[PDB]
Amino acid sequence: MVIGVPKEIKTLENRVALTPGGVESLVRRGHTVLVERGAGEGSGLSDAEYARAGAELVGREEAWGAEMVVKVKEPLPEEYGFLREGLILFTYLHLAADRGLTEAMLRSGVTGIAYETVQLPDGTLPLLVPMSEVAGRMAPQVGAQFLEKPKGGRGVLLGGVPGVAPASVVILGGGTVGTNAAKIALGMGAQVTILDVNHKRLQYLDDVFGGRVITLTATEANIKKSVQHADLLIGAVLKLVTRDMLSLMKEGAVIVDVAYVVDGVVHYGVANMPGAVPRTSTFALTNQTLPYVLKLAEKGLDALLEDAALLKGLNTHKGRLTHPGVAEAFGLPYTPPEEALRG
Amino acid sequence: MVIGVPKEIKTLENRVALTPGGVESLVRRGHTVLVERGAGEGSGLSDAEYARAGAELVGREEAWGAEMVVKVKEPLPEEYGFLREGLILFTYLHLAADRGLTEAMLRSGVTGIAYETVQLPDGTLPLLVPMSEVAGRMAPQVGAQFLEKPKGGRGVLLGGVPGVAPASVVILGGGTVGTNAAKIALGMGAQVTILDVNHKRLQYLDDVFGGRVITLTATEANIKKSVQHADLLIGAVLKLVTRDMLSLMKEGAVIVDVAYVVDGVVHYGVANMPGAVPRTSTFALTNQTLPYVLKLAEKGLDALLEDAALLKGLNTHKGRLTHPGVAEAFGLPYTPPEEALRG
Amino acid sequence: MVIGVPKEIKTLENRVALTPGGVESLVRRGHTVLVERGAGEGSGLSDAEYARAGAELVGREEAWGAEMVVKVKEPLPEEYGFLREGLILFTYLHLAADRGLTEAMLRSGVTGIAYETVQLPDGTLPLLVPMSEVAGRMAPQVGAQFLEKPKGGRGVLLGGVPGVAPASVVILGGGTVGTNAAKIALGMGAQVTILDVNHKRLQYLDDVFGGRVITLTATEANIKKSVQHADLLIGAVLKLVTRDMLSLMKEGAVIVDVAYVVDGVVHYGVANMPGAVPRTSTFALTNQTLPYVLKLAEKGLDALLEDAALLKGLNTHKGRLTHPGVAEAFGLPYTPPEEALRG
Amino acid sequence: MVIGVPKEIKTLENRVALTPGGVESLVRRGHTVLVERGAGEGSGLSDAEYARAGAELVGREEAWGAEMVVKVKEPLPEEYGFLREGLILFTYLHLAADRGLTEAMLRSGVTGIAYETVQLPDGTLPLLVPMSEVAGRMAPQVGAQFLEKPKGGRGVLLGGVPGVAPASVVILGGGTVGTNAAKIALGMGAQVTILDVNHKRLQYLDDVFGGRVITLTATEANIKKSVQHADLLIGAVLKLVTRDMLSLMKEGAVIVDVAYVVDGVVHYGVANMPGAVPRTSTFALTNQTLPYVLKLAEKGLDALLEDAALLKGLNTHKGRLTHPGVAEAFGLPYTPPEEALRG
Amino acid sequence: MVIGVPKEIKTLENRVALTPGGVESLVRRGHTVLVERGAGEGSGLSDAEYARAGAELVGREEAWGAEMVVKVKEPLPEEYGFLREGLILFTYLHLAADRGLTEAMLRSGVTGIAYETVQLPDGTLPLLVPMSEVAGRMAPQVGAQFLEKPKGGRGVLLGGVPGVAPASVVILGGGTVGTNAAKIALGMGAQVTILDVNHKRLQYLDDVFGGRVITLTATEANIKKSVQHADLLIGAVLKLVTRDMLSLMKEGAVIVDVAYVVDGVVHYGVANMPGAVPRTSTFALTNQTLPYVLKLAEKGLDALLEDAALLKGLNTHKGRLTHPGVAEAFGLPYTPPEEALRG
């Protein structure tokens, strides 16, 4: 199969859908990969590497000329023209949030597979989990930066120094994001308290952290008190913390919600934290996606029919909307993915 | 030399100055060891174990008849009668705090050596440290116990449980006692905060505990705030905490000062904590004293002239008071130990 | 809905079924809570606190007047009078152990939901787990206390001191009580050996504790050798140790079965350990019950038809016995909860 | 005594030489403290806090009118007028690096005591150590920040994510900065490798970190290979790394020397890192200086004659340059502090 | 200076006294280095690496012609002819154990500096310590090997497996070899018990290990009981364990004394354990010796007069025996090093 790797055009997006290592695995198996020049520069992956890996350095249009195009972000209006029927697109789509795109792909009849909807029997979204993991690792890093006086923060060090008390990092949510943030916050020296509604989850977290991390049952009483004394508040869920509670936070305190100033509290609202470390995110994403890319390049659409999880990743095929969530959202005809695939 | 080990007669004292293992080492070198019946029962060391080790089971008076008697506590008035010139008594003497005894020993001509005045060059008291060590470990243990409601405490568990925050343990002083308190309090799950005046000690404690224990410089401001939020306060020094601050502590909190209710705070005042665990104390003490006992058994008083440390242990000898401290304490003539020994 | 919180009258019981914090949550949602004065003093929660929470400090009878009464312990005879048909009683009932209570409730037609029977699909009892947890954290603490000589114990420190070996704490059962006890015993410095019949559980425990804890297959030979050298034996299961093995234990050793002297070994038999730490137990319990109190408070009995686990909490309704187990034990007419609820 | 606390006017300086709690100690001991309005704002310590503490909130000139002025940074030209004979100035002077200041101070006849030259017998600078510690904890924090792509870094996460290898942090120096950098670097999950020339120090670090951190003897071969594979390079000593080696460094890698771009490597040169977290630094610094301030307040210069470590802090007095390093550096008449003090 | 590195001719010796990196350092400072061909092959350092480092690959005799010869082991009878007056020999000499060598060295007038007698003020032997460290790290490694049945051992795994108790490793000595042996044994999962006479050392070890390793004061009682239950016995001191106690040891147990079968136990007696990992050893030795070689090449003998620690490494010079210990062992004229040097 002729696989394509366009360069991400969405501003500030520095990740890439395929690494040289991944290209090598493909070329090694007899496939041919067209990698648009500079597609990897954002993550330190030069054209030269993609060259030794066996890829073909092409231009923008040539890249979209492949049977399957592997990307990171969704297609911008500027790219709606490359969408065609026989083209299988594999990337983050987030259709439910962009009606424009949902129609443009539908009208184009392109078969689009969303990373975010690929999902295992237990409900986990294996191609979204990587980004959730770096986001968490990043939250306390970004938080620490903003607790810095020059950034208008309280001016304290998360773990203090011998003789001076560490700071308080309160984490709401014991999920993938919460746990990864806890690891780093703990490692930076802070007194980490993480809240969650599920007890089994807190029992598990108590096991992994010895007892070094304070676990509180996510009751309103506990959230209120935890937030009140937090120097750094990390939201990791998605109305759990009202602007009323805000006033209870000490001035200089910062809030980083993975899901400017208000009351003296610094809020950090910059979407893609994983975008600040493009190289890491890329390996994190591609190490999970490569296996699926290998199956599609090897069995085309039959790959989707042989893997329940991958199958669910299908949203658009021959003008049909095969994802129930997006259908209900825009009030459109939902066609069962397997059905639309066999027709 | 014939060595005697009487039973401790001071009420509640259950430690023993020589173990079956110590007896074996002496007997193996040719000395005859007289152990009063039941001398070790307080520590779980039966007469039977002493017999197998090579010890001879005798009566009280026969024990005191040896050339060298090895005890734990000081002779009570009831024993003043066994004191005699040629006898070398090795035990905790604590003379400065008991003129009646010091006068009884001085008048007797007995040669007494106090475990607590044996001193190394760097100033450490090797035969007294063991007790500070078990006292420290006992501290959080007794506090926990008293934090239990049934004993009038706040009714909390130091480490809490998954979902419930741990309690706060504040340790005043980072020396031997405070450091051993910390190890156990930390182990019990509590949030441990230890304050001290010496920064190098705090840096050290920060290293040994990773970051698990909050180290705070012992400023009045820091002592004030720590005490006020402490659930269990452990004093490990010897005027640092005034009854004033006492009113800051939440009720039910308890205090254990290794060095009854007042303001809703439970005070624990029961001296020898190491006494609650006589068998542990017995080994921690005898493991250190034995080496000296062997030297004395082998070289007589020359053990002192060949060891500056063991020399300072001498408090009395032939009517001479050989410890400056004890002298300045009772306004008595101080005779240099090395000088009194050679005359 | 009006909710009643009666003060626990069972002697020594100092736990309260609702916390000021839980009350505020209820009131915030427009509910009205009647707190019997001093109901939370046993756990350090004063009437003033409940007052600020929005509670109405009433008297005994008034508090049983609410539609729902949230308690900790089962109804004592003296209270049977309040049990009425339109009353929803949510508490620990242990009906299979109190026939008199069973019938008293059946005759009163009161709808009684037992905490201990609410059960999740995987079979866990979420409202009982909290108590299993504090019990375990307690086992070693209470075990340490009775190891003290003044208490008739062997007179040893679980973690010893530098140069003196630590004691041996054997835990039978790697479940929730076992695992929590292991944490505290490990923390106190003991050499912890835990036995279980399930291999995967031992594998997991080997992972959470690194290797710091000795995991042993619960064979009879292992149990026998462990019990024999144990300084502290912790029972956490329910005939696993016969009065025959008992003679193999060293004198002074103690046994704490979470499920007086016999042969020199100290047996600790004082039921509710969580009881000695009422405040902690209260929060651990009320943290898991609040979500359900809120659901009942908001949807009355529909809550049971909307939550399979909560439904299995129904033991008695309008004279019907909705719990199989209690019915089989007392040879009585078992009526399916969902059924009895719809009639 | 009358102690003055001027506000730091050096641009970007937000620390303050005295805290409310420290003012409380002095006032408690009969002294009067003149704190300049706003002196603690940069560290979040308002004028009101200082007022309640018992301090007198004054203007710029009043503060300098005290007998002893306590500052953080050295006096700027604009502040030379405040220097007079009877004045005792306590702050970081760094005289060897400012002739103009030194001359201004000698001409004025002001007795100047420098934090950085107060030295202990073993050679440590206790009033300098606090800052080395926060600079160290801060080093990987800042490095991580510049490793982010938007900042021009290689774009990686120091500890990676599950499945993605961590970054490499090399620390040159195992002193105070270096060890504190290691703790935080290791905590953020990076592969930390620290080099030093003292073997005992490396043995010590190896004991404190388990073996989680790689210790390399600081030979040129080792320094060269370490720098070459470093993703983040922290300098913590003071020619160890030449621009030659700089070309060995991967591009995007960043260097933080506590003691722009060149070859693709991002160099971070921004003096006072402790300044980013002014609050933590003030407490770290003042917690150490306070006891000295208390001694100078109580006995004046006699405090130096009663403390050998504090004595070496003297750099100027009645026109006498009392510090050898500075004297030799500028080629001026050196006068022993103990001598100049008694004249 | 012209420096020479002969190949170690002692059978089985594979370490080398200088690495390509050390050669680079020397050559970089203008010295010329003669490395005998194949000198580092036993450590994996080829003649080509030495050539690239700037070394000159020479024959055996040419290497000896250098002004200074750096070796690992001592001169063999076959190498005595290379000794001359103007030669400075730096290596492990162990003269006190080789009269013949001491005599030959005196008759040749060669100036010999022993690695093992170079001593710091606190008494540490900085050039011998590296070997004590690798020997220690190896002890349990080699111990496990022989605990294997095929090698005749008891047939156990040091750390066992989940469900099976681990083995017991008893280390005699808390020194360098003992502390490092503890690290590996503990790392391999064994129950480690380490004994030592010095309490402060045992206190330190308790801090560094947390509580994972058992510390026992080295009394005869503890040694006997410890040895009796040991699966692996490591000697790390130097009559502490008699053939009597050897009978108390279980069959299959092995003994590794860093400092055949007898009674069923397996004695492992193969001198240089560091010799099994020459590469690791070469680097650990040369990393410490390089600084001294650099000082010796730069200042010749003035290096000893400028460093008291290195001065102690002098054993022979112009026919004078400058080491008191050796002089006393063989009964020959002792000449203070400083003196012999200035004449």
From TrEMBL, chains A, B, C, D, E:
Every Alanine dehydrogenase/pyridine nucleotide transhydrogenase N-terminal domain range: 4-135
Catalytic reactions on record: L-alanine + NAD(+) + H2O = pyruvate + NH4(+) + NADH + H(+)
Origin organism lineage: Bacteria, Thermotogati, Deinococcota, Deinococci, Thermales
Name of the protein in question: Alanine dehydrogenase
Annotated organism of origin: Thermus thermophilus (strain ATCC 27634 / DSM 579 / HB8)
GO cellular-component term (any): plasma membrane
Active site, renumbered: 94
Domain Alanine dehydrogenase/pyridine nucleotide transhydrogenase NAD(H)-binding: 147-269
Binding annotation for substrate: 15, 73
